[PDB]
RNA sequence: UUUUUGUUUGCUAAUGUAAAAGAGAAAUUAUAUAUGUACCGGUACAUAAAUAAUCCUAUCAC
RNA sequence: UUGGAUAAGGUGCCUAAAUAUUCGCUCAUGAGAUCCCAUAAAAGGUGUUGGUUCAUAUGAACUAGCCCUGAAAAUGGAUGGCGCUAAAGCGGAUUACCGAUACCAAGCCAUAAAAAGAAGAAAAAAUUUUUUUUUAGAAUCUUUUUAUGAGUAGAAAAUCGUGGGGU
RNA sequence: UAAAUAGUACCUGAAAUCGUUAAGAUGGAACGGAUUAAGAGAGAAAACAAGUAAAGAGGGGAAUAUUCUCUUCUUUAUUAAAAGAAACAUCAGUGAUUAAUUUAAUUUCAAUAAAGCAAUCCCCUGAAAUUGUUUUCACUUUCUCCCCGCACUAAUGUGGGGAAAACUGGCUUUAUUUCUUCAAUUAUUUUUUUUGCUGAGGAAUUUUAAAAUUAUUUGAAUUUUUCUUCUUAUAAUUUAAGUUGUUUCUAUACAGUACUUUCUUAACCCACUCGUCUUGAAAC
């Protein structure tokens, strides 16, 4: 599992195989909820969709 | 005996295995495959000299003195019968709110703390366990009410295992009688009953 | 094989070490590194912090130049607006 | 005088609920002197007794109790959710329960 | 909420906020008695509230006004109707909650000799800016056809005099008890005295 | 609501009744799937006569066994207990409805001396 | 009107609670201030300004 | 089904959850109040709140927020109702919370697919000797595993019953 | 007459509909779904006691009409055990809550006590002289002083006009961070308080192996050690290898006021008339 973690975190030579071997993650709803799934994360109003960049980490943590 | 994964030292005591289940294909087996179980790990505020409040029994609301941790999670307690009328009773921890006052923080009782420990070192859970023979004798007479109650009392008194507890009670109470009685406000504190007034908020007040 | 309880691979130490054979060493190293006494860091905090003075100097300098550039742009725009006014 | 209390008083509000939908697995309970989530969290493991009278005797007694336990806080104003062994009847809404000091 | 009954002095409260708080209490099962309902305040000018009540009055089943909305002019009945509108009165539980409420104009015989409580969350002084118009429920009711305002006023002034006499007697008794307490604080044991002094008694 | 007695879980009691059988005497309560077009029950409207479904099925480890944790076997003869001689602990016996008093007494005697329990032991006496 | 026992041919003894666990609390009023007292609405002096964040009531058996 | 946590949307009462926090705007003698959605315009205002450009804290001209006029219909009437103005209205912001048959963990039913399969003692209770259970092997079968489950018209399979016939 | 509730309409004798009695409900429908509660009927086939001794009634089988043996009921007294449920505890899975924590990065700060610098001056900031570079003034507190109004104020002060140093504020050095501060965010780690729900399975040749832990033991490494790591061997344990234990109660009963269940009533939430044609039916 540490090898899988390495190959996933660093897009190593065995990445397609590890990713395909891995079943799709079935996440919980966020602990504190979303802001608005309707709107973009980059919109000035509260929103969720789009590229969160490094901010995906806290959302994953609440969803995991 | 213990195990300390991740630095815990959980402490293991032997456990019997009596539940029996039928096997998948042919036989029967004992369900429990374990031989040790981790110990009780009672509360931090539970010490020998502390004074606690009983919450559930016929002595609910009464104040008592912790006596001994009884090797099985339950703890012996004596709200010294000579001052309070609370006998030597084995009580469960979670049915007992323990205060912050130690009987042995008093100058005139820290002296006899050692004798108290010596007297209390010889009580055990078997003494509190009710014997099958006396249970049968008590249930026999169920097949007028005043006579039934009196005979139940007599059988309990004549139980040989109750008598040793009564003797320990008597000697501990004799040891603790005059020192407790000479703290007049504390003596009344012990003889009093803890009640929840409508001005006290139990998520604010301290045990 | 019969499915059993899925042990928590993060908090259950036995299965965690089963999955990651290096985890026991890594955690032990982290624990012993945490176990370091406070006196050493108390006596070394100033020694560590004093060496960062040059970094603080360049660190102030970069932000100073950035704010100078912002102010110069503001002044240029104000002058352009004044010129446009007449 | 006599009949010591040693329990906190509470009132049975309705069930765990939304608008026009009920979840009678949890009962909303209001505790006497608690009005915040932080204070409601204090009574979380505590046992709850719904003691109610009865028209006739059932074990020589006219009184019986439904046992339950606090599970978690509800909302922000000190309301809690309690789970009982059997669902308390909606005739009991507004009645008194005992939040006991034990365990 | 945990009393046998709560007596609320409705003087200076805003009608809607008062009704909301009362309705929630009744639904939770607390019996309340609302007194001095003629002194309830409503935000907005008296003329504006009178216009609202005229709109209410123009409302009736033209087939048979007997079945129509009964309009009710007493301020106590107006508060009762507002509370009912804030309540599921068409169910059995809602009807019990509604019947748990008692409304009075002035202060009748049992309720003038018991403690009156106040809901700060509905006080006009705390909920209306000083520069904004408000009306008095008794005045609105009189304009609408209640015509018992002045009698309630004179009953209130009589009750005020009686309460003033009672308060003077109570103050004298409290002063005597206080002096007795100070004189007796020197006769108890010093340890008990220090306990009382330390804990502010 | 589920009822749980030991290892036995009855996922649902109060057997399903036919839609509108409560207010039509010609419609018997025996369940019939509403075929309909706009039939409320068929469309699964809230608060009306839910339909049976395979999800309610009982755990097959404890499916057909009675509250005594035994499967019932209906006999009409003394000669129909020979299989039970080897299954006395997981089969209980029930006497058929149309068995006379003589044969009933014989069957009860044989079951007792076979230590096999009888469900309707005190019938016709 | 008071005490004891009980309400464990269609009938002829007979029980119900929407809420006991200290279910404790009577001044009035103003909110860009009030309240008491003393003199002639005014004057003067006190009081109050996290007010229930308080006070009062409980256990000392015989 | 049991717990958990959420979506949409809400948290003054009806109604579970904020009379939450924080910053502005608005007074309406027919205020306003969630997409679809349940109408409103041209034109105006010396109401108030911000801005912009000109003239020695004054005079103007614009601009756009909320408010007002323009704004009349027939049973009595509808921001859903109550009501709400130090909002319970309008525009934000910060948190917490409530909230599905959706999501997550676990159990069970069935469907689909899969891994595999044509013989020996286990326990307990009494007192070495007894007693109590079991000691399995049906291939459209047995054991285990994972995923999945709306449904008219329509199709199929497996089941449940009735009269009569052979065994 | 076996039977007349088989009396000529005569076997059985359903439903619709109606009568009697009992119980219950009853504010412009009634019924219903889901969840319980209260009552009222029934009930022991898991919802305790197997066995042992005696006497009473019986039934069988084996033994060459006489011995042993197996048992079924009834009573006596004479012992267990198990099952369920609660409470507590333990473990595991899955959450909720409150206290933290290692090591780094990011202009952080803020103090203590001894000196010093600048005075519209300082860390800053502001306005002016194919990019940088340089310069000017203008920026602060006063519970300070002076004049004018000289009581004019919101004011226990004030408005206007001038001076002062340097308390305050800023900077430069040395020592300290437990007097005080050492934040926040992120990355990387380690814990912790109080607690909700759940316990599938039961492994005759993988509940094994290993993994972890404990106690010995060998060698080595190293962050240098009372949780340091890596193996050599042994013996165990569970954190492995899906819940186990204790104590009570039911209960020392043979059916009740308890337990299971049906029914009747309530109560909270929900619920429109079915079949059909139809894009669309609760449909006026």
PDB file of N, CA, C and O in Angstrom, chain B residues 15-37:
ATOM      1  N   UNK B  15      -9.611 -14.077  31.977  1.00  0.00           N
ATOM      2  CA  UNK B  15     -11.054 -14.097  31.796  1.00  0.00           C
ATOM      3  C   UNK B  15     -11.469 -15.519  31.453  1.00  0.00           C
ATOM      4  O   UNK B  15     -10.785 -16.205  30.686  1.00  0.00           O
ATOM      5  N   UNK B  16     -12.551 -15.981  32.065  1.00  0.00           N
ATOM      6  CA  UNK B  16     -13.071 -17.293  31.727  1.00  0.00           C
ATOM      7  C   UNK B  16     -13.884 -17.213  30.442  1.00  0.00           C
ATOM      8  O   UNK B  16     -14.173 -16.133  29.925  1.00  0.00           O
ATOM      9  N   UNK B  17     -14.232 -18.379  29.913  1.00  0.00           N
ATOM     10  CA  UNK B  17     -14.992 -18.483  28.674  1.00  0.00           C
ATOM     11  C   UNK B  17     -16.037 -19.571  28.857  1.00  0.00           C
ATOM     12  O   UNK B  17     -15.705 -20.760  28.839  1.00  0.00           O
ATOM     13  N   UNK B  18     -17.295 -19.172  29.037  1.00  0.00           N
ATOM     14  CA  UNK B  18     -18.355 -20.122  29.331  1.00  0.00           C
ATOM     15  C   UNK B  18     -19.446 -20.200  28.277  1.00  0.00           C
ATOM     16  O   UNK B  18     -20.132 -21.224  28.212  1.00  0.00           O
ATOM     17  N   UNK B  19     -19.637 -19.167  27.464  1.00  0.00           N
ATOM     18  CA  UNK B  19     -20.649 -19.227  26.420  1.00  0.00           C
ATOM     19  C   UNK B  19     -20.276 -20.289  25.396  1.00  0.00           C
ATOM     20  O   UNK B  19     -19.144 -20.324  24.906  1.00  0.00           O
ATOM     21  N   UNK B  20     -21.229 -21.154  25.069  1.00  0.00           N
ATOM     22  CA  UNK B  20     -20.994 -22.283  24.181  1.00  0.00           C
ATOM     23  C   UNK B  20     -21.934 -22.184  22.990  1.00  0.00           C
ATOM     24  O   UNK B  20     -23.138 -21.971  23.161  1.00  0.00           O
ATOM     25  N   UNK B  21     -21.385 -22.336  21.790  1.00  0.00           N
ATOM     26  CA  UNK B  21     -22.149 -22.244  20.556  1.00  0.00           C
ATOM     27  C   UNK B  21     -21.894 -23.496  19.736  1.00  0.00           C
ATOM     28  O   UNK B  21     -20.885 -24.183  19.917  1.00  0.00           O
ATOM     29  N   UNK B  22     -22.818 -23.798  18.832  1.00  0.00           N
ATOM     30  CA  UNK B  22     -22.632 -24.946  17.958  1.00  0.00           C
ATOM     31  C   UNK B  22     -21.746 -24.573  16.780  1.00  0.00           C
ATOM     32  O   UNK B  22     -21.803 -23.454  16.266  1.00  0.00           O
ATOM     33  N   UNK B  23     -20.909 -25.517  16.367  1.00  0.00           N
ATOM     34  CA  UNK B  23     -19.978 -25.290  15.280  1.00  0.00           C
ATOM     35  C   UNK B  23     -20.709 -25.305  13.942  1.00  0.00           C
ATOM     36  O   UNK B  23     -21.893 -25.634  13.850  1.00  0.00           O
ATOM     37  N   UNK B  24     -19.984 -24.928  12.889  1.00  0.00           N
ATOM     38  CA  UNK B  24     -20.604 -24.837  11.573  1.00  0.00           C
ATOM     39  C   UNK B  24     -21.039 -26.203  11.061  1.00  0.00           C
ATOM     40  O   UNK B  24     -22.146 -26.346  10.532  1.00  0.00           O
ATOM     41  N   UNK B  25     -20.196 -27.222  11.214  1.00  0.00           N
ATOM     42  CA  UNK B  25     -20.451 -28.507  10.578  1.00  0.00           C
ATOM     43  C   UNK B  25     -20.748 -29.624  11.570  1.00  0.00           C
ATOM     44  O   UNK B  25     -21.785 -30.278  11.448  1.00  0.00           O
ATOM     45  N   UNK B  26     -19.875 -29.886  12.543  1.00  0.00           N
ATOM     46  CA  UNK B  26     -20.089 -31.060  13.380  1.00  0.00           C
ATOM     47  C   UNK B  26     -20.319 -30.741  14.851  1.00  0.00           C
ATOM     48  O   UNK B  26     -21.392 -31.051  15.367  1.00  0.00           O
ATOM     49  N   UNK B  27     -19.382 -30.122  15.545  1.00  0.00           N
ATOM     50  CA  UNK B  27     -19.426 -30.137  16.992  1.00  0.00           C
ATOM     51  C   UNK B  27     -20.061 -28.905  17.598  1.00  0.00           C
ATOM     52  O   UNK B  27     -20.825 -28.182  16.950  1.00  0.00           O
ATOM     53  N   UNK B  28     -19.770 -28.689  18.875  1.00  0.00           N
ATOM     54  CA  UNK B  28     -19.990 -27.423  19.548  1.00  0.00           C
ATOM     55  C   UNK B  28     -18.645 -26.918  20.043  1.00  0.00           C
ATOM     56  O   UNK B  28     -17.672 -27.669  20.124  1.00  0.00           O
ATOM     57  N   UNK B  29     -18.588 -25.631  20.365  1.00  0.00           N
ATOM     58  CA  UNK B  29     -17.336 -25.043  20.807  1.00  0.00           C
ATOM     59  C   UNK B  29     -17.631 -23.898  21.757  1.00  0.00           C
ATOM     60  O   UNK B  29     -18.748 -23.380  21.813  1.00  0.00           O
ATOM     61  N   UNK B  30     -16.612 -23.523  22.524  1.00  0.00           N
ATOM     62  CA  UNK B  30     -16.691 -22.314  23.327  1.00  0.00           C
ATOM     63  C   UNK B  30     -16.495 -21.112  22.417  1.00  0.00           C
ATOM     64  O   UNK B  30     -15.517 -21.039  21.662  1.00  0.00           O
ATOM     65  N   UNK B  31     -17.437 -20.171  22.469  1.00  0.00           N
ATOM     66  CA  UNK B  31     -17.403 -19.035  21.554  1.00  0.00           C
ATOM     67  C   UNK B  31     -16.167 -18.176  21.780  1.00  0.00           C
ATOM     68  O   UNK B  31     -15.500 -17.765  20.826  1.00  0.00           O
ATOM     69  N   UNK B  32     -15.841 -17.901  23.038  1.00  0.00           N
ATOM     70  CA  UNK B  32     -14.748 -16.990  23.347  1.00  0.00           C
ATOM     71  C   UNK B  32     -13.411 -17.677  23.115  1.00  0.00           C
ATOM     72  O   UNK B  32     -13.116 -18.705  23.732  1.00  0.00           O
ATOM     73  N   UNK B  33     -12.602 -17.111  22.228  1.00  0.00           N
ATOM     74  CA  UNK B  33     -11.266 -17.622  21.969  1.00  0.00           C
ATOM     75  C   UNK B  33     -10.195 -16.911  22.781  1.00  0.00           C
ATOM     76  O   UNK B  33      -9.021 -17.279  22.686  1.00  0.00           O
ATOM     77  N   UNK B  34     -10.564 -15.915  23.575  1.00  0.00           N
ATOM     78  CA  UNK B  34      -9.603 -15.132  24.333  1.00  0.00           C
ATOM     79  C   UNK B  34      -9.427 -15.688  25.740  1.00  0.00           C
ATOM     80  O   UNK B  34     -10.318 -16.325  26.303  1.00  0.00           O
ATOM     81  N   UNK B  35      -8.244 -15.439  26.300  1.00  0.00           N
ATOM     82  CA  UNK B  35      -7.922 -15.839  27.659  1.00  0.00           C
ATOM     83  C   UNK B  35      -7.694 -14.670  28.600  1.00  0.00           C
ATOM     84  O   UNK B  35      -7.847 -14.843  29.812  1.00  0.00           O
ATOM     85  N   UNK B  36      -7.355 -13.493  28.087  1.00  0.00           N
ATOM     86  CA  UNK B  36      -7.158 -12.311  28.907  1.00  0.00           C
ATOM     87  C   UNK B  36      -7.996 -11.164  28.368  1.00  0.00           C
ATOM     88  O   UNK B  36      -8.259 -11.075  27.168  1.00  0.00           O
ATOM     89  N   UNK B  37      -8.417 -10.289  29.274  1.00  0.00           N
ATOM     90  CA  UNK B  37      -9.169  -9.092  28.924  1.00  0.00           C
ATOM     91  C   UNK B  37      -8.569  -7.916  29.678  1.00  0.00           C
ATOM     92  O   UNK B  37      -8.052  -8.068  30.786  1.00  0.00           O
TER      93      UNK B  37
END
